[PDB]
Design a protein around this ligand. Structure first.
Ligand SMILES: *[C@@H]1O[C@H](CO)[C@@H](O[C@@H]2O[C@H](CO)[C@@H](O[C@@H]3O[C@H](CO[C@H]4O[C@H](CO[C@H]5O[C@H](CO)[C@@H](O)[C@H](O)[C@@H]5O)[C@@H](O)[C@H](O[C@H]5O[C@H](CO)[C@@H](O)[C@H](O)[C@@H]5O)[C@@H]4O)[C@@H](O)[C@H](O[C@H]4O[C@H](CO)[C@@H](O)[C@H](O)[C@@H]4O)[C@@H]3O)[C@H](O)[C@H]2NC(C)=O)[C@H](O)[C@H]1NC(C)=O
Ligand SMILES: *[C@@H]1O[C@H](CO)[C@@H](O[C@@H]2O[C@H](CO)[C@@H](O[C@@H]3O[C@H](CO[C@H]4O[C@H](CO[C@H]5O[C@H](CO)[C@@H](O)[C@H](O)[C@@H]5O)[C@@H](O)[C@H](O[C@H]5O[C@H](CO)[C@@H](O)[C@H](O)[C@@H]5O)[C@@H]4O)[C@@H](O)[C@H](O)[C@@H]3O)[C@H](O)[C@H]2NC(C)=O)[C@H](O)[C@H]1NC(C)=O
Ligand SMILES: *[C@@H]1O[C@H](CO)[C@@H](O[C@@H]2O[C@H](CO)[C@@H](O[C@@H]3O[C@H](CO)[C@@H](O)[C@H](O)[C@@H]3O)[C@H](O)[C@H]2NC(C)=O)[C@H](O)[C@H]1NC(C)=O
Lengths: 101, 145, 121, 451, 145, 145
């Protein structure tokens, strides 16, 4: 019982490089992402698909074109890699993760 | 004192003393900075909540409402400032037909406008359409070529 | 600035009932919504529920219908979560959350410390 | 180009929105004898004896119901007027002392809810006391199964929250209507057109100087005495996929509903101070029966199928299913309902057992220590009314919620009845009537020459 | 009713009914002695402190503030009373250069002054210097010799 | 800023900047809708009874009284709108006799207005006589035959 999804499922990048992530496919609604797990409860990164959230680094910005919806993930660090999620209202994504090194 | 010094006198006499009302219709002896009174001594208790504070505010604002409304009704006809004015439409057929002699010779205004009261809206409409003709003619004069 | 307090994680057996509490301080409780969330690693997170403290309203999740309950207490300024007949499937961490403003209830700005619950046998 | 086209015109038909106050208006005939405060108070102003309206050619405007301020304005004003009604004539209550009750035994049989109860109040003399039959009704007592309640003795429910205030016996309570109208420099616009989704442009637009009167009756999850819809059925809701917000439903056709407090009753006075008078149920006479309501099942089913064939339009192939109350406190789950001063709490389970694709009866309970509005303070205490009391109304709408969770194509969709937010009892009628201000000093380039 | 019955009409038609707003800009149906409502009966409880009393006085004073401010901004340009005025100043280079036909033929004013709003202060400045030139020229004419 | 930007300048220079006082004597920065401020956020608690509420209403209505009284006193002489007026009346014998040179060359109004205060009523009386003569002459001019 799932409608929401996101791609790519898993990535393998070193510290400091940039990645491209995207949520799919066509269900209407406000998009959102929640930051990689640091160990405690995660924090926000973005509002309304393309609005940076307060108290967040400037490395990360979204983009939306109808069904197309991408997020660039730049200058990763060992202190920021982890399991991060995509969300619309109730569902969540498959739970992507970017592994450092 | 306004009309209160010359109310019941002749028609022509009233027109000669219309001016001292301007002080009389806005100032008020007691509400505010009058021709006789200034701000009160113990104003700290006037500013703090009191019954007579509500009274003074109500009275002063009602006077302002009154003056602004009547001036605006007079102003819209292009008669602002001019104590005597004049309109671009003759008088309707009904009511009409009363001789001028007694009215200015010996009548006083107290007994005059009682019959005119119910028809006053008609005079307002007539002055209104008069102003409409005047402003369109002003626009036509503005149209030089 | 605002923070949410929790009583920590508690561990238990399969097949029974349990409780957990959360509270808020500042940005008064009575006007704005609260949302429970469950985190099971290796499994999708699930919107647990949302309680509007203004009138005791609630709309539980259908997959968990019946055996999960919520309650408020305005004077104590707390939020009680109650569930019944837990199974190993519910091995997860729990949070109490708040929104940016009192018109949207999904982009969660403030989260609790987190509270694990494990059952194995 | 002569004088490069400069001038100014007066009047200037332009306007813009502006958050601002609104104003009172009521039929000022009957309420000249209610000297104490009440909704359509003898103050305010008589209603205009000649309402006016005009249809405006080709006017295009985008009504938006959820953004407008004036609903919040009145939500504050009614609460303030409520306080100013129960600030005077109110007897602060030194109740909550040791009390003891038992089974009433009015007849040989035990009554359902009342309990004949003793109570040692203060006498007029501050030194001594005396005992009288006094207030009992079950939900307002902290119980125990022993020979007393609470833990021993008992106390009234109010005395670990705040001091409950006595309601003025002289002050009536009825939903007497009120109009609104704006001061000079402001005007009200009205969307006559139908099938309005609460947003977007509305074409058939007419300007009304002063709004029509409403009956601001307070209630939950059963909109009642509201004006019927223009035609058929309509949904007026802020989005549907966002399940958080509440969904309104409004009917063109009415449905009769009636409720009865069948028992005869009489109030007996009790003195609690120098000039402070207490009230409560004194005695009960005649046939004993619980409070209940009657409704025609056929029309109820007809309306539920009507609603069903509407909201199916907002989904391609899904199916609906009503359900009983969500849960929680009695205030939101049961059907809050006000009747002449007495208050009703009615279980609504029987009204939502249906599914999609002759005289139902409702169980109800009176309640006498109310904590409505914010639920934080200002709890009031109504006096019981003599004799029987009945009242009827026209159901007009329902307040639903969409729940959530995981879904798949071909699965069922579930709706539940809820409420609580008193504002959603007010947005039903006042979706019309935007508030707007006229700015008469616009300009335009045009040729001219003074002299 | 004023433009509440004539807002969306043609520009020429709009100029023909600019008058009746004077009643509609000051009176108000309910606050005061309107064209339909006089003072209320139970005024003893109106004058005593009440929430709606504060509402009444707030509404009255806000309307007065509004009308006085607009009429003052209109008066300072020498346009007092004249529903149609005229100034001795040209229009600036920017924002300009739009054809006049559509503006008078079928245009409605609701969409007109949207783009003029941000530049509206500039017209006030231009009219201000116009009045300055006019008053100094009046002083010079006053200077006969 | 009104005279507050050019109060102490020369006699002639004051006339060139009389206009910006229209904004500076009606709006006020803070009382109501101004050139810098608008309605407040927590107005639900301002409309409800408050210590500063009566202060705000008093300030507004006092400013209205201030403007209206002097505006009427100027209007009754037929000088409405005209920032520089003129009357058909000579000046009395006493007080008189001071040379014009210093009064405009270097003097400023700050040192001039004190000594005319006690005689100020006399100017109002003479202007009233002027208006009386003017209105009777207007009435006679209306009498064509
Ligand atoms: C939804 O809309 C519907 C449709 O409009 C609307 O329906 C009406 O609902 C009301 C209930 O809310 C129905 O019942 C009415 O109840 C009256 C009972 O109250 C009487 O007593 C009040 C207090 O006085 C008592 O106590 C004192 C002191 O102890 C004692 O001296 C008195 O004798 C009395 O016992 C009193 O306030 C009340 O009203 C009076 O005052 C008001 C306000 O000034 C005035 O407007 C009234 O006219 C009246 O003078 C009343 O006195 C009941 O009396 C009333 O009328 C019946 O009785 C009188 C007298 O016997 C008969 O003359 C009359 O013909 C009736 O038989 C009325 O029945 C009411 O009936 C509904 N309407 C219809 C048409 O049936 C709903 O309320 C709306 N809201 C909801 C939630 O549904
Ligand atoms: C109330 O309920 C709504 C559901 O009922 C809910 O869902 C949606 O919320 C979004 C909010 O962002 C609304 O906004 C947008 O609506 C358009 C409408 O489609 C038409 O217009 C687009 C133009 O969009 C262009 O610009 C946007 C940026 O603004 C770009 O992302 C977009 O790619 C375009 O460049 C037009 O393209 C559409 O055309 C179709 O074909 C093109 C070409 O193939 C596709 O690219 C396109 O995706 C579409 O297939 C079409 O003509 C929508 O298309 C946007 O994607 C965006 O969703 C929605 O209107 C709204 N849904 C509905 C049905 O209105 C709301 O969120 C909810 N409100 C709240 C407050 O909760
Ligand atoms: C004093 O105020 C309280 C608060 O509203 C009144 O209600 C009491 O509220 C508490 C809140 O926890 C109830 O607690 C109970 O906890 C047990 C734990 O097992 C649970 O099983 C119950 O369902 C309930 O949640 C308590 O029952 C409730 N009532 C009483 C009598 O304490 C209280 O009535 C007020 N008066 C007094 C005298 O306490």
């Amino acid at each position: 019982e799932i409608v929401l999804t996101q791609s790519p499922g898993t990535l393998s990048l070193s510290p400091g490089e940039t990645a491209i992530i995207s949520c799919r496919t066509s269900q209407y609604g406000s998009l959102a992402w929640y930051q990689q797990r640091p160990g405690q409860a995660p924090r926000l990164v973005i509002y309304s698909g393309s609005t940076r959230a307060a108290g967040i680094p400037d490395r990360f910005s979204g983009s939306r074109w109808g069904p197309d919806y991408n997020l660039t993930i730049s200058n990763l660090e060992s202190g920021d890699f982890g399991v991060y999620y995509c969300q619309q209202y109730e569902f969540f994504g498959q739970g992507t993760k970017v592994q450092v090194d | 004192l306004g009309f209160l010094g010359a109310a019941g006198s002749t028609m022509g006499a009233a027109s000669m003393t219309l001016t001292v009302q301007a002080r009389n219709l806005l100032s008020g002896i007691v509400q505010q900075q009058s021709n006789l009174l200034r701000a009160p001594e113990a104003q700290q208790h006037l500013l703090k909540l009191t019954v007579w504070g509500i009274k003074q505010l109500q009275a002063r604002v009602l006077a302002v409402e009154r003056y602004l409304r009547d001036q605006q009704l007079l102003g819209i006809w292009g008669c602002s400032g001019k104590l005597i004015c004049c309109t671009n439409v003759p008088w309707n057929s009904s009511w009409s037909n009363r001789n001028l002699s007694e009215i200015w010779d010996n009548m006083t205004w107290l007994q005059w406008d009682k019959e005119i009261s119910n028809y006053t809206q008609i005079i307002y409409g007539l002055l209104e359409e008069s102003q409409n003709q005047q402003e369109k003619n002003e626009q036509d004069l503005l149209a030089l070529d | 600035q605002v923070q949410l307090v929790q009583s920590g994680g508690q561990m238990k057996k399969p097949g029974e009932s349990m409780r957990i509490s959360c509270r808020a301080s500042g940005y008064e409780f009575i006007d704005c919504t609260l949302n429970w969330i469950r985190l099971a690693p290796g499994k999708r997170p699930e919107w647990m529920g949302w309680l509007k403290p203004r009138g005791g309203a609630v709309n539980y999740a259908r997959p968990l219908q019946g055996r999960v309950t919520m309650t408020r207490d305005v004077y104590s300024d707390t939020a009680f979560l109650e569930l019944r007949s837990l199974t190993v499937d519910d091995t997860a961490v729990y949070f109490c959350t708040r929104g940016k403003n009192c018109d949207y209830n999904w982009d969660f700005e403030h989260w609790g410390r987190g509270t694990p619950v494990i059952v194995s046998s | 180009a002569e004088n490069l086209w400069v001038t100014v015109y007066y009047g200037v038909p332009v306007w813009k929105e502006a958050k601002t106050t609104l104003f009172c208006a009521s039929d000022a005939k009957a309420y000249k004898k209610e000297v104490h405060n009440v909704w359509a108070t003898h103050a305010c102003v008589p209603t205009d004896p000649s309402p006016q309206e005009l249809f405006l050619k080709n006017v295009t405007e985008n009504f938006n119901m959820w953004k407008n301020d004036m609903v919040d304005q009145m939500h504050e004003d009614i609460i303030s007027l409520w306080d100013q009604s129960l600030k005077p004539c109110v007897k602060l209550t030194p109740l909550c002392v040791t009390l003891i009750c038992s089974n009433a035994t009015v007849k040989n049989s035990t009554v359902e809810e009342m309990k004949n109860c003793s109570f040692n109040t203060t006498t007029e003399i501050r030194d001594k006391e005396k005992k009288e039959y006094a207030l009992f009704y079950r939900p307002d007592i902290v119980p125990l199964n022993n020979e007393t309640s609470n833990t021993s003795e008992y106390r009234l429910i109010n005395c670990n929250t705040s001091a409950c205030t006595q309601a003025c016996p002289k002050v009536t309570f009825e939903p007497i209507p009120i109009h609104y109208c704006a001061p000079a420099g402001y005007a009200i616009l009205k969307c006559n057109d139908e099938t309005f989704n609460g947003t977007g442009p509305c074409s058939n637009v007419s300007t009304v100087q002063c709004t029509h009167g409403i009956r601001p009756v307070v209630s939950t999850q059963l909109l009642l005495n509201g004006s019927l819809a223009e035609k058929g059925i309509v949904i007026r809701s802020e989005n549907l996929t966002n399940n958080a917000k509440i969904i309104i439903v409004h009917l063109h056709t009415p449905v009769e509903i009636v409720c009865t407090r069948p028992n005869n009753n009489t109030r007996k006075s009790v003195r609690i101070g120098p000039g402070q008078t207490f009230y409560a149920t004194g005695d009960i006479i005649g046939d004993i029966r619980q409070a209940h309501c009657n409704i025609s099942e056929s029309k109820w089913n007809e309306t539920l199928q009507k609603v069903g064939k509407e909201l199916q339009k907002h989904f391609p192939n899904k199916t609906i299913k009503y359900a009983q109350s969500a849960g929680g406190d009695m205030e939101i789950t049961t059907h809050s309902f006000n009747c002449g001063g007495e208050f009703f709490y009615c279980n609504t389970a029987k009204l939502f057992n249906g599914t999609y694709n002759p005289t139902i009866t409702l169980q109800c309970r009176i309640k006498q220590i109310i904590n409505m509005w914010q639920g934080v303070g200002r709890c009031m205490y109504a006096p019981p009314i003599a004799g029987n009391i009945t009242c009827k109304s026209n159901i007009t709408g329902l307040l639903l919620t969409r729940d959530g969770g995981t879904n798949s194509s071909g699965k069922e969709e579930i709706f539940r009845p809820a409420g609580g937010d008193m504002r959603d009892n007010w947005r039903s009628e006042l979706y019309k009537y935007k508030v707007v201000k006229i700015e008469p000093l616009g300009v335009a380039p045009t040729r001219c020459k003074r002299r």
